Amino acid sequence: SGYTPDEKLRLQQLRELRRRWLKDQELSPREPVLPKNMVFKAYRSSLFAVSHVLIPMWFVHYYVKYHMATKPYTIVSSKPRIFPGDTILETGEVIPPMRDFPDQHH
Amino acid sequence: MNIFTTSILLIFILLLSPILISMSNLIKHINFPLYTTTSIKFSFIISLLPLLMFFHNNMEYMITTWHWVTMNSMELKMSFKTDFFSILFTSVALFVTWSIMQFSSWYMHSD
Amino acid sequence: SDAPPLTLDGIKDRVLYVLKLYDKIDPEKLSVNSHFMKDLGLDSLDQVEIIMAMEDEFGFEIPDIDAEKLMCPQEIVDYIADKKDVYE
Amino acid sequence: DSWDKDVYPEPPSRTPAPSPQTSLPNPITYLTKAYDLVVDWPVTLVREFIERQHAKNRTYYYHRQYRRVPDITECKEGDVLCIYEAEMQWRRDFKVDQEIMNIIQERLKACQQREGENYQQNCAKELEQFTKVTKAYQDRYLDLGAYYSARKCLAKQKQRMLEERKAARQ
Amino acid sequence: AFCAPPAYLTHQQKVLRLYKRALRHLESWCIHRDKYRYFACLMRARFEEHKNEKDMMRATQLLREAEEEFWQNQHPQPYIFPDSPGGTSFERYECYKVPEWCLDYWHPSEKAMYPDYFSKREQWKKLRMESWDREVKQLQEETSPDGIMTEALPPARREGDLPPLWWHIVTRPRERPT
Amino acid sequence: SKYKPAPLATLPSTLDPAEYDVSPETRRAQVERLSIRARLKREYLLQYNDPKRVSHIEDPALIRWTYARSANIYPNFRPTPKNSLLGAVAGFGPLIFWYYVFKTDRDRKERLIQEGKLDRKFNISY
Amino acid sequence: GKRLFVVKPSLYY
Amino acid sequence: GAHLTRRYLWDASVEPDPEKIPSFPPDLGFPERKERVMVATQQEMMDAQLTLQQRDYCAHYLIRLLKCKRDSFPNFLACKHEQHDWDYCEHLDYVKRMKEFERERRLLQRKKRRALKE
Amino acid sequence: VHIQPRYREFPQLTRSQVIQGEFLSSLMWFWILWRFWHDSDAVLGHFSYPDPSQWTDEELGIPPD
Amino acid sequence: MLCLGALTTLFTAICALTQNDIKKIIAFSTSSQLGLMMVTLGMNQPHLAFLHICTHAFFKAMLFMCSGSIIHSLADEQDIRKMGNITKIMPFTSSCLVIGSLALTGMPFLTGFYSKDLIIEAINTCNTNAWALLITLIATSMTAMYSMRIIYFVTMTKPRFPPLISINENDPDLMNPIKRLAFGSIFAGFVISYNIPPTSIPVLTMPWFLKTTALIISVLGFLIALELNNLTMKLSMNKANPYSSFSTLLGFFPSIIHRITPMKSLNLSLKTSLTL
Amino acid sequence: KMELPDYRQWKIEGTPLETVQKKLAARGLRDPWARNEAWRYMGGFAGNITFPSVILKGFKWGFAAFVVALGAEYFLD
Amino acid sequence: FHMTKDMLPGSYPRTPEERAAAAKKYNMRVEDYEPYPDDGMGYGDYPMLPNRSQHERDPWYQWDHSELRMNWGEPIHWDLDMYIRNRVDTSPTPVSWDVMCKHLFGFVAFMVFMFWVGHVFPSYQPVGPKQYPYNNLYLERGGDPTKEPEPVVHYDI
Question: Prior bond to H22 cis, omega within 30?
């Protein structure tokens, strides 16, 4: 069955007060009362790249070269690939090439 | 041997920068999602650099930035093993997270 | 941007739109105060189908007790406005 | 570099000369040149300034050396003075041995990272050194307990020497 | 939600609830609209053919059998509207549904950010203060001395009066506060 | 083709047989339960919407639940053989079980170490 | 526009 | 694979298992069998830093492919010929393994025929 | 950027979204066709898997009988 | 590891076969791909597993982004039963979703070719468990099946969303990251796999049915799922089966375990430790 | 404000809903919500979406670009 | 506060007047009130509410404790902290519990048995072992350079 007159009148009055409350929830046009663009490539990326990237790169490079490379086993890299026919920069010798490759089918 | 480590630690510094900006009380004056998205894309480029280096010479790296503690014979140190896996997953994760940050800026609006 | 707000006139228009698309209700006798059983001559299954149509339109369900309380398009409009906080 | 290759050995690098077959420019070479000119030059300038300031204000510090006090083996039991001196000397040597083990382990890790795919063959002497120093460390310091001391180390050594002597009987 | 449940559901209400739930699960199975309309008209035909039952004991038996059939043939994952319970968006904005009494604890600077809103808030508070005594008297008058009591509440019955216990209903947080 | 209820998957309130065979006693019991519920709801709503209230609403049901869970258990505890056996098992059986587990493991380890058959490869920091 | 007040706790402290 | 159903359905006497291959002496049926030759030696493989899995009898082609890629790191799509050479060598090695498998399978069949003759 | 909502009709589509969508679809299909034309090793490989039955006993080195 | 990965990829594909929430479908797809990576680790192919990590990261990022755009355009509506006509109403998102589905199933020379098909060739041509191999192939076919389910019930058929059209995908903040992930999901597997240093020597001498296995089973899964979806379009109610109930209710694992283990644990806690 | 289309435009002919209506009238039944469901089969939604039509989207321009690329490669080599 | 010992829970009721007093204390009907059996487990007069979790509660009703789905003043189950919505669920399932358990156990057992079958009948390729040079890579696998290994000879075919 439908609404009783009791519940219908209560819902009507409650909804009207809800309309009033939600209308009062609006903001006045003065609310709230608070107390060099150039282009994106030329300016916006420029100062960000020179501030948040370049200066941290300076500090990181300083720490890496003068506080990490000065320690013995801090930065350890694997040996480079040495192929036949290569010339060693540090030593100066050329390692001999491989054999004659008897298969030339493909 | 310096540019490689500098790029890795610069990835980490560029990631740590928006956290310090968040706790440094200037968020109300800047566009924080856009700033973080630019931070992620610059981290992705700076991570593309060791990707190219490893694709060239296959250098395998181990970097011990900071010594944390020493307990008798165990020397707990902050070390990074810059591998094929580390480099490639770092680049892929940074690219994906750049897309995720921009999509989050679109999607979590009115939040 | 997305998700435009609801208005009272929009809710009324959409409710009357669905009720006019209903075949058992002739659109010339339909009013916003037309009772489903008094002057429309419908039944409880028809009312349940009407409420399900309104749920399908507005993308959210009405609970069963309020749904069986609803018996006229004005009541449906008032329920939708009260649920969605449409004050004007 | 404050470190020395006598205690941190490192094989000399053998890098190959570049042999670019392709005609494309190398972005790695371009980026390294730009990175040097932009980052490395100001960093080395400010580091040279810092070094010359340190040269203006130069100070020195020394490494403390302890004379050898008599060992606990010649200390009478119940004589807490010489026992204390020997115990402090033993704790000092224990800490030195901990750092020796750290040095050997760091050397082994450096060997493994340097060799990479050839570590199972080219780190044979590093692994042998690690195994020998690990065996010696286990013979002198293992199973002492949380209250490790010169007395406990001496008792363990005496027990081990007694077992070795009894095994040497037959 | 806006109405309180009674002591028990009558037979007609149980049948209507079964009909609506059956239609929802039928749409969950059918997916496509034309197929759903066909099978929903068939389900309506079944309910119509069992509508005119006069014994009411056989009607309760048919309701029990229909409920057994529904529980055998229900969709394991029926469609739920997102705002409905069990949905994806249900209770999503409860983290943002801040109650209105934190403005009482707001600092005078934060109040000074919003002068007109707080003036209207004070007007609402004064209205609540008078209406509370008025509605407590009304609820004492309206309460039966003994007998059956339900959760329904009276409206305002005189001019210049408000319904009892209106504050938590009228000043509830919005469903989309932001 | 029948739903079998469980303690962890209960019977639906629309599938239980007690719903369809109703009695006037059950109807008046439900009406009395609704009356009790409505009285409690009315009292709570008065206390909730009172503007002069400056504190939280105390819940005697929550107070009773906490008191029954905390301070009433030992006054209402009586030693029976069943709970004596249950307490003895739940207080000793895990202890005896883990005692035998650890004793067997450490005895095996000590035997292997004393006979030399257990090799400590690089265990230097125990 | 039609902007509405957002109820927030005291973030001042 | 038809070998799998022949082993698990017909019999396992003539169908061999992958673990003990070969189960016959290498000179059985071969009058002279030359030893397999290795082109790239241990020093060159160690300098090329090949993994121990890939130090097989195509290590020289792998070394050539790696040298090509290191030389022409830009334009990485330039060692297709070396990639094809290394893949063809691996295909030949796989064909040799298949030849070994079927050789010892036919030797198992020959053993069964000898047993039936005796 | 904002577009007018439609109640029950088909929405009005901007040129940018349809152009970019068909561009991405065409780019995917062009890449697939180009790679399939150039290196069609997705099908059959390029090594022509041998049938072992045609290998001879003289090259498999089994003794005759 | 091989057995565990095969079991979980089969189970998660089966669970994904009959889901309705699009996020649930692609999450079970993610779990199936993780099971495939665990299979690849069960074989001695870790580098193929890492390559599949990268390629699958691209696929799932773009797929989830497209699904989120669908959800935001349909006003936080998440299940596929109230979608439809997405190909015509959201053309950019539909195009990128189709790209993601094809690259997940392993259409040739996309980003999924260079990891998934090498994994399928390796599992076909290496000595492993037979049942793990069979259910891995069935899981790949079912991956094609649920991708077709997504494509059908979202991008195809008639509209089923509520009438008020509030679709607006014209924001560059939406278009640009999806475009970048689309470029990734097209070209990144190719670029990465041609820049990978050669390791874990693949076998390439295999019969034709062991070479085109992944493509054949993907096409078969697409055709089977298309026929099943047309049967669902056909106007007839069919009686539900325990297989479909098992698939839809996630194999009864969440209900059974998440009801029996918290109950036993917390009941043991209160009824024994604290009280007794 | 927002203006709704004229509800009289929602007819039933040429529809799967019309097929459903024929099937129901075969059983002596009438479907009254068909016009409410009619908007999903009319106008810009009135079209059969096919799985080849979804997969082969942009295939024409992709093949055209492929042909142009082949011609460019043949001209350069 | 104003909570006294007559409103706090007490001992196990013996007499009908004690049962009526307990029911009035817990705001329950006398017929609905039924305490735990007097097994000496410390329950006292606390009621035996039915073992249904808060998921079975009506979600469309405005409970006084909306997270708990409970009203104010109604008796609280002894295991509310186990039956909260963040925890153990007792809601009815579309398929019965015994059938769910049997299907789950049968699926797991069938998968385990099939894995065992595939293990005892492995699938492979008609190939021999992988061929490796230099005595199966003795030195690079880490053999003793001083020791001479037993030579491993591989032949062409």
Answer: yes
Residue among H42, H96, H58, H18 nearest L155 (CA): H96
Q: Please check whether residue C66 is in contact with residue E2, taking contact to mean a CB–CB distance below 8 angstroms.
A: yes
The answer to whether K43 contacts chain J (CB < 8 Å) is no
- Placement of tokens 């030593």 in the chain: A91
Put simply, whether F124 touches D (Cβ < 8 Å) is yes
Is residue D124 within 8 Å of H57, Cβ to Cβ? Answer: no
Burial of K44 (0-12, 13-18, 19+ CB in 10 A): middle
Structural contact between residues A21 and E167, judged by C-beta atoms closer than 8 angstroms: no
| Both tokens assigned to B78 | 């902050």
Chain B residues with CB-CB distance to J30 below 8 A: none
> Looking at chain C, which residue has its C-alpha nearest residue A22?
C87
**Cα distance from I14 to chain H (closest Cα, Å)?**
39
* Coil/strand/helix, residue I3: coil
Contacts of J126 (CB under 8 A, 6+ apart): J43, J203, L124, L125
The minimal CB distance from H52 to the residues L121, L141, L156 is found for L141
Whether F contacts K, i.e. 3 or more CB pairs less than 8 A apart, is no
CA distance A106 to H85: 6
B2: how many CB neighbours lie within 10 A of its CB?
A: 19
Instruction: Mark whether C43 is an active-site residue.
Output: yes
All partners of chain B with 3 or more CB pairs under 8 angstroms: A, D, F, H, J
* Residue J165: DSSP 8-state: B
Handedness of CA L140, L142, L147, L153 (dihedral sign): negative
How far is Cα I10 from Cα K43, in angstroms, rounded to an integer?
7
Question: A57: which residues sit within 8 A by CB, 6+ positions away?
Answer: B6, B10, D39
Domain that holds residue C13: 3-88
CA–CA min distance F72, chain E (Å): 34
Structure tokens at I30: 């062009």
Q: Do residues L30 and L37 lie in contact, with contact meaning Cβ atoms separated by under 8 Å? A: no
> Going by C-beta distance under 8 Å and a sequence separation of 6 or more, which residues neighbour residue C78?
A11, A12, A15
Rounded to a whole number of angstroms, the distance from the CA of L105 to the nearest CA of chain H is 29
Find out whether J61 and B94 touch, Cβ atoms under 8 Å: no
CA neighbours within 13 Å on the CB side: how many for L22? 23
- Does residue L50 belong to the interface with chain J, where contact is any CB pair within 8 Å? no
Of C13, C26, C39, C43, the active-site residue reads C43
> Which residue among J94, J187, J207 places its CB closest to the CB of I21?
J94
- Reduced to 3 DSSP states, what percent helix, strand and coil does chain H have, rounded to the nearest 5? 55, 0, 40
Dist CA K33 CA K17 (whole Å): 10
CA-CA distance, L56 to F3, in Å (whole number)? 17
- Collapsing DSSP to helix, strand or coil, L109 comes out as helix
Dihedral sign for Cα atoms in the order F68, F74, F77, F83: positive
The size of chain A, in residues, is 106
Beta bridge partners of B75: B70
Closest chain C C-alpha to I30 CA, distance in angstroms:
35
CA F28 to chain centre: 33
Contacts of E2 in chain C (CB under 8 A): 66, 69, 79, 82
Amino acid, single-letter form, for residue F4: K
Number of domains in chain C: 1
Please give the method by which this entry was determined. Answer: cryo-EM
The first and second tokens of residue L45, run together, are: 């007069």
Q: Do J259 and F83 touch (CB under 8 A)?
A: no
Which residues partner with B66 through β-bridges? B78
**In this structure, what token pair is assigned to residue J188?**
């990144």
For the record, the structure tokens of K4 come out as 């709704």
Chains in contact with I via at least 3 Cβ–Cβ pairs below 8 Å: C, H, J, K, L
Task: Please give the DSSP secondary-structure letter assigned to residue F73.
Answer: T
Identity of the residue numbered A86: D
